Design a protein around this ligand. Sequence first.
Ligand code: FMN
Length: 138
Amino acid sequence: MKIVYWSGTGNTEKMAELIAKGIIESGKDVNTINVSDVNIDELLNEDILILGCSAMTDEVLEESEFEPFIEEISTKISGKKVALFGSYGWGDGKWMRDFEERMNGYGCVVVETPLIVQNEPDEAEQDCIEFGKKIANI
Ligand SMILES: Cc1cc2nc3c(=O)[nH]c(=O)nc-3n(C[C@H](O)[C@H](O)[C@H](O)COP(=O)(O)O)c2cc1C
């Protein structure tokens, strides 16, 4: 499996590692890839795309790297399963509500409720691991 993410200070990156740990504990393998090093053709071979990005600017996806990546794959993911996650700071998840609506609009099947954690996942560590386990069970 593959987890692609963008993280500005490391919060979403930490979530990614924990979600990976959950998948691995379930007995499967998984690679975490920062959005800047992703190979789209390979990524499209996956049955489930696990994507993460923190809330940026004003409730939107990071603009210089993550957003273009989503635009890039938008036309080639109809019918694919996707799981979404990310950290946020002061809002209440508007950027994630929009991200989920967007992926749905592209024809994707959002397999689970998106996982959002405020700031660093300290207390939510197990929640991240459990999300990974849910994904590994699909
Ligand atoms: C320029 C900038 C804009 C942000 N905009 C939002 C926002 O609209 N809503 C929110 O809840 N957090 C916002 N945040 C806070 C981050 O989403 C939050 O600090 C998160 O934990 C960062 O995760 P990361 O280290 O994975 O990037 C913003 C942070 C920065 C740096």
